[PDB]
Amino acid sequence: MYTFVVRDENSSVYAEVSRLLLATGQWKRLRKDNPRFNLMLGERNRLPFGRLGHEPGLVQLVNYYRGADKLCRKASLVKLIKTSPELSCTWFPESYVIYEVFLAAYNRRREGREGNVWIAISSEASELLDFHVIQKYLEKPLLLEPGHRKFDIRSWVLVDHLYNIYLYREGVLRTSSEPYNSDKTCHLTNHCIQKNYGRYEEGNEMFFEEFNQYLMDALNTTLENSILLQIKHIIRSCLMCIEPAISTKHLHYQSFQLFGFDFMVDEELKVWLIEVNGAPACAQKLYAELCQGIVDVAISSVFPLSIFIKLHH
Amino acid sequence: MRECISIHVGQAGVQIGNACWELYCLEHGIQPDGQMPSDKTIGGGDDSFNTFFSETGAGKHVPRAVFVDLEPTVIDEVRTGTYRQLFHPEQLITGKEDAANNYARGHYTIGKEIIDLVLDRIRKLADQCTGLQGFLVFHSFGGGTGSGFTSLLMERLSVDYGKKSKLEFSIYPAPQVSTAVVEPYNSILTTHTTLEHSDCAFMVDNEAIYDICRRNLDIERPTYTNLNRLISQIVSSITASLRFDGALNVDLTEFQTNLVPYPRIHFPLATYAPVISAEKEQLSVAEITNACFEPANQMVKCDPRHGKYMACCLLYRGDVVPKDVNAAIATIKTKRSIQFVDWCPTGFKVGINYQPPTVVPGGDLAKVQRAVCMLSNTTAIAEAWARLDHKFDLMYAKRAFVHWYVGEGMEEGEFSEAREDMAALEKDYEEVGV
Amino acid sequence: MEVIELNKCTSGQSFEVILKPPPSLEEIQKKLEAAEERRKYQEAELLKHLAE
Amino acid sequence: MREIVHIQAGQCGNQIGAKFWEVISDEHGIDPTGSYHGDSDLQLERINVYYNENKYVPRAILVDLEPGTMDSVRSGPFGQIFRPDNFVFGQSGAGNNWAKGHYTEGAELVDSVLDVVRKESESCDCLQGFQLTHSLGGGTGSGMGTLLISKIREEYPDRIMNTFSVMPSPKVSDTVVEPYNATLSVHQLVENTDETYCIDNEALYDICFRTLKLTTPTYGDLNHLVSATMSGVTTCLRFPGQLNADLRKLAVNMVPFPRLHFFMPGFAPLTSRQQYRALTVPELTQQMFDSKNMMAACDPRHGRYLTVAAIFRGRMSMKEVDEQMLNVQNKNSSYFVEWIPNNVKTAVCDIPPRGLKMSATFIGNSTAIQELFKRISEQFTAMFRRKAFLHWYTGEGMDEMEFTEAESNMNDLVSEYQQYQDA
Ligand SMILES: COc1cc([C@@H]2c3cc4c(cc3[C@@H](Nc3ccc5ncccc5c3)[C@H]3COC(=O)[C@H]23)OCO4)cc(OC)c1OC
Ligand SMILES: Nc1nc2c(ncn2[C@@H]2O[C@H](COP(=O)(O)OP(=O)(O)OP(=O)(O)O)[C@@H](O)[C@H]2O)c(=O)[nH]1
Ligand SMILES: Nc1ncnc2c1ncn2[C@@H]1O[C@H](COP(=O)(O)OP(=O)(O)CP(=O)(O)O)[C@@H](O)[C@H]1O
Ligand SMILES: Nc1nc2c(ncn2[C@@H]2O[C@H](COP(=O)(O)OP(=O)(O)O)[C@@H](O)[C@H]2O)c(=O)[nH]1
Ligand SMILES: [Ca+2]
């Protein structure tokens, strides 16, 4: 009988993961502050990594990689991509962190007057700085038809204690419902910001079977060939880059973590990385399948009793 | 030549002191009777090994050591042990009843009764020193004597020998090995009282030593003798520069100069490699140097990747030359997360002693051709203070066991003063570290 | 990169490598004696209770 | 500190006291004549704790208001091992009356006991303190025993007082006033002992009936259990080890608050006065934590362990011991308070008790012990709300106020245990 504690009540994903672990009759939930646990479903903030791995005769596992914030905070991601030799980066939009070089490149865009919109969405600088990271706005997105709509792709990625990198085979398109105007409901694709909402797909959510059917029909290409080779590339670049800093290979406690990568596809079928989410939620239709897989490959692999693409073994 | 006096306090200090002086003797060729054939200057000398041993006209080499315990059974083993002839009776000091794992009983009740005797016996060793540089103090954080009498002695040494340096080797408590329930209380009480009076302190976490003994020596249930022989190897690595010809860390003041820029933050992390089972493949300079950055070889379990460095010394022993060190360092620096504070140079001070580590015949450790001890002052060690501070907090919130300390003359206010000091200590690390 | 302060001897060598530049005896006695007095006080209350 | 001074008082005190010296004399290789005939040096290393010395004399003082039980000891097997001057008896007895033991008959005799106590404490290189065996339901062990504890404390305020105290139960009862004698005594014990092993005659009976399958147990059957326990919980004081425990270190580690110092002992394997199969370390560990092995009739699953000390005796895997002990804390981590980290400790001793190859002893400071005091409080109140049998006490000079005070103090004791069971 394994033992676990729960320290994030707002986590929908690990509310389901705990509800599944109990449902095998081989896992036992303890009070918040019992140290004698096998698994910690820890808090988003100030998780006490320093107290993990010091209980005699207890293999201890936690669902957060200490140091993974360097990927999941927007200022940190820009700094990490810019200064890492292994990232240098054709898939990350031009970005500047501001609390000057921005201005420099901005003028080089004033020169030829090429598309000079940025986000923090404005067209001229001094209106942005008067209002963080300044990031080149992608003026030519890929637009879905019918509807001339914007979207973004959320990929769910699980890193286990062996630092194997698993991409969930179900993604989600989080689509705009008002057509794209070359106002922000058509520019920001957030699932909350939309609720025109609900017209084309239930909940402004297109799943992979239909996006692939769409791309086949409209563009004579596949989800795999046009987009997914690039997504698997970005996930691997990002996580292999920080692997030395955060890995728990020869550590006194082990880590796993679920990530949500957010991508944007432009109209040349190129994929760009928007941001990396460290405590993501799931699409309601996929909660069941994804949460069971977390238990299968992240938790049971350490405590024995595929819906995943292996990016790394 | 400047002399160093060693003080072993309580069970952990005395038994670890026993392991070290056995090792020192083997390393210097001193026999259990105190005779040193190689020493051609009979009855005296100012060689480097005379930092730790004095000489008698009969050619006996005598440790500049004081063993003090508030109870007799442990020091009595020294008096009748294989090294009995080495020590003077006046160097071994025992009370009658110990401190019952109670800092207050050790510091107040019983320390008041024996402190003058201990100080006198130390004076007899100081009076034989033409230039005494200071003390090495060996003790546990958790024992009643090791915590309470140590901090009283520390206070008194600062008074009686103000211009003299004081280094600690402190056994940090781990439930895997023993532990009185109140060891968090004692740990914090003694740190708060000793912080002002210690120049450099090497913490050894019993959990780190236990695990290295199981994992690297395949000892199923390690004993104190297993633990201490490994600990004394690391202690020898650290003290070797005082006992041998060299240029790095040749007097106690240099430990502070090289490892402690900020006086309160004076706990360097020690990492040792290689540890190889004697009953069980010669590692390279690059391999043993890279092992200095694996958390499984540290004397305190923590993650240096999540802190900042303030100073870093590599102490080699055996077949090592500078060329191989610098190559290994070039390799490691482009593969590991080593970040120094912005106000300190990113560099290693390296020391090499050509004599390969010595092992105790029939011990668990194997003779190796080269070995390294890294001493780094990383803020990551604060993890160990936080763990300890948290256990203190749990018990103190219900005032559990507090009555045994108040019962000895202590005031409940000493607890919260002590804790507030460690709260400040944890913050000093937070500032320097992020 | 830079290697500085190379000291060789027969016993070994040392050097620096750089990879990138940047209470009195009275106050104690008081404490000790105050504690002893609080012990004395607590024993006095005890024997006073036992005499009752 | 080395020496312990042992006092046995009253009928039950001298009977469990005599069995204890019988058991540990065998363990340390001391014959009924006081001569050492053992083979292991581990037998002699700490013999000074309980024996004066080439014959070894138990540092024991025998006390009764009645010559009977003590006479049985002098005529038994080991009766020739005790120092003859350490027999201190009266003639009138205490009539199962706490007031007689404490105030009238016992007062007459207590100074002669303190004389022998002084004589032994003066031969001590470093006295640890005292262990008293007695029952709480009679009059000598209950009333005179607690009177002694008070007078010893006055003359040795800085030594440790520990007792093995047999609690009365209606399932094994001699007279109806036992709840009165027990309540009066627990009041004293709360104030004047550092650590009391609660041996509950109810639990000893149930173990003899329900487990050892004895349809009608005698006091001998109960006292076989007690002597086995007393040997267990003193193992770490008498044998060389890695911990090398003593009465004060025991009190410091086990007693978080001065009043809450009443311990439930436990033993495995539970035996009758044979199974030839030695147990496995998983079996010792499961059994010693089972309520069915508890010597106080309290369910630990009804409270929380504040602190626990365990000792394993015999040749076995220390790695397996460690594995099993940490396992039991996982399967019960709700029953160990979270505000005392690492509150379970494990010792190993090589020499097993007589007849076993392996054994485990358990010392628990559990808040479930309130059930035993609630039990006694109930029995007390059932008679006291009608002043029943009170005349036996007022006839010795006692006022009803003293009864009111003692009851309130045990009720306080119960509620104080309840406070930390919810903390
Ligand atoms: C009389 O018998 C016994 C007594 C005791 C207690 C005891 C009780 C407790 C507890 C811890 C300890 C423990 N702590 C330690 C351990 C190891 C040390 N190592 C070095 C220095 C100090 C140390 C201190 C004992 C030290 O001495 C005692 O008397 C202590 O937590 C919950 O309650 C324990 C026994 O079993 C482990 C035992 O045997 C059955
Ligand atoms: N590594 C190591 N730890 C030890 C040794 N001896 C005791 N300890 C540890 O030290 C702590 C207890 O301190 P002790 O040295 O036994 O205490 P003490 O100073 O003798 O104090 P008292 O016995 O109370 O007078 C525990 O955490 C033990 O794990 C030893 O020889 N080696
Ligand atoms: N460079 C860019 N070009 C065009 N649109 C961009 C953009 N950067 C962001 N966006 C848009 O802004 C929206 C805001 O979400 P964004 O991913 O930037 O932060 P966020 O944290 O609110 C999403 P989540 O919480 O799901 O990770 C995105 O959905 C995307 O449509
Ligand atoms: N376990 C045990 N209990 C006993 C024994 N003798 C008496 N008792 C119990 O002790 C109480 C009676 O006290 P007793 O010792 O006979 O009185 P005393 O001689 O005046 O101190 C009752 O609760 C009995 O159940 C014994 O040998 N073993
Ligand atoms: Ca010489």
Ligand SMILES: [Mg+2]
């Ligand atoms: Mg000791």
Ligand SMILES: [Mg+2]
């Ligand atoms: Mg009777």
